[model samples]
Target: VVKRTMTKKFLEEAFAGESMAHMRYLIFAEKAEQEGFPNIAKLFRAIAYAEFVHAKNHFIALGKLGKTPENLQMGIEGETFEVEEMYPVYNKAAEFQGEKEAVRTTHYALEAEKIHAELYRKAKEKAEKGEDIEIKKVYICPICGYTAVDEAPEYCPVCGAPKEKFVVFE
Candidate 1:
């Protein structure tokens, strides 16, 4: 195990803060757009990207990066944790409190994390053999974060979003 030094701890903390700022700013941008403030939205998005770079820098300085296979393994572990532990508790609490929005959000994350974990496992298998995973296209549902490789579904399996709602990555 690596040493638990003060610098490592501080980097982790800084990464967390910057990551949160990145997301918060993006969300703010979305709200700004909805409110018809286009320039404000653009500014928010710009700063959000800056925050993302800061978070990435901190994460690298903390030595959290790994090679392809190792990175995929990390993805698997994080997604599995969200699926098997984090979301279950969060979902249950949301349900207990009768919070419809929280329940829906947590449910979406839980379902997407399951697929992500499986995809990471397959990618890692290929990476371990010094080969890249084959992919023609990747599609992501904007509403629910459902990911599909090669082809998009006519309707999103998790959120029932139409095929056109998927953002294609090629």
Candidate 2:
């Protein structure tokens, strides 16, 4: 039994932790699969989903649900934060520590997040006007996570992945 303030804080913290765990486990699952340990990969993927369930429960408990435009606003803020503050700091630390993979991954994410922020901003504008945003196609670069709307680039600007390497949605 706890007061509302403390309870809300605890739920938010737990949601963040569980959300991170979910991502960590999924990444671990992918690595495990690539390393030829399917059983280990399965366990990691399953537990990642469990962590996702926990995260969703915590988020719902925190009463964070909102309308579409509000959700898009949250998305914009999250992407912008990663681009403007979070990834920059993390990338600097990785650079200082000579962590090559970390630096590369962070740089990829930083580049993609800039695009995502603008995408979310545009969506939010349409959503606020009670209109759904138009979309013809969505393409995502497999290597660097760069996302493009309607069409993909000849080569990914961030990772130089070829156009054929992009995964298409719709």
Candidate 3:
């Protein structure tokens, strides 16, 4: 097991915060584009990429980026926790508080995480066999956070976001 220390704790926590900010900025960028603020959207995306770099640095400091098999296991555990525990508790709380947007966000995460976990498991299987998975592209929904491995779906099952709203990563 990886040893835990204050620096590791801080690195992981900061990584989490920066990662959230990265995604949040991307979402903000998408909204800006929809609102006709092209330059502002561009600015948001640029800052989002910077946030990603910061988050990645923090993650590296924490020493969590292991070999492919270990990385896939980390992905599986993280997504499983969000699906099975974290998001469910948060979703229930948001629902009880009548915070519709919070409820929606949590629900979207709960559903997407199942897919994330399954995908990670599949990748782990290949990694265990010392073979690389045939991944070509990744598409993430700007609206509901549905992640597609290779091709964007016609519509997001969670939020009905069209493929046009999906962001592609090669």
Candidate 4:
């Protein structure tokens, strides 16, 4: 019984770490893209999903613990400063690229980061207010770097990532 209890506690901590990682990577990916490093952004995006898996595993463990899985916490408190700091670096990288695709990507990512920050802030507020929980949808492509919001497409509109790569966010 003691061992089981410890395992549950570990799972909870792991869940929190994974959640933090997910947010961090998304911010990193945005910065990379803005800095004219789409490839790096793609890499970060892929890792973000891996972090999501870790979070989900923890959620499953929580279910096994017979305790309700709580909504994720958000905000600056929940995120690392690295996520925010990446933007300026990305901007510098873009400037170095002389206003090319890399710069454009970085600029786009910078904008996206701002939006993500707002989304996280709102999510934090909802969690604090005890609002209804919403499950996120996941869209992924294995053949290419394509992702979508809340729904899977039959064919990867981007790099033709396989349907097998797609899974529900949970």
Give the runs in model 4 whose Cα sits over 4 Å from its true position: 1-3, 64-170
For 1-170, candidate 3 gives per-residue lDDT tens digits of 23678777878888889999999999899899999999999999999999999988887776767898998898888888888989999999999999999998899988876888888898999989999889999999977778998889899988898889999999
Task: Please tell me which model should have the higher lDDT, number 2 or number 3.
Answer: 2
In the range 1-170, model 4's lDDT, one tens digit per residue, is 22488787888788888999999999899899999999999999999999998788777657633322232332443333434677568778779877676665555455433434444555666666767446386454433334455667776554455566675565
Q: lDDT per prediction?
A: 0.91, 0.91, 0.89, 0.64
Higher-scoring candidate on TM-score, 1 or 4: 1
Whole-model lDDT for model 3 versus the true structure?
A: 0.89
Q: In angstroms, give how far residue 113 of model 4 lies from its true place.
A: 18
- Minimal lDDT window, size 10, model 1: 1-10
Q: What would the TM-score be for candidate 4 when compared with the true structure? A: 0.38
| Residue 30, candidate 1: C-alpha displacement in angstroms | 2.9
Put down candidate 1 lDDT per residue, 1-170, tens digits, no spaces: 22579878888889999999999999999999999999999999999999999998888777788798999999999888999999999999999999999999999988876888888998999999999999889999999999999999999989999999999999
Quote each prediction's TM-score: 0.89, 0.83, 0.75, 0.38
Q: Which pairs of residues have clashing backbones in candidate 4?
A: 33-105, 33-106, 34-105, 34-106, 34-107, 35-106, 36-102, 142-161, 143-161
Error of 4 at 163 (Å): 35
TM-score leader: 1
Ranking by lDDT: 1, 2, 3, 4
Residue pairs in collision within model 3: none
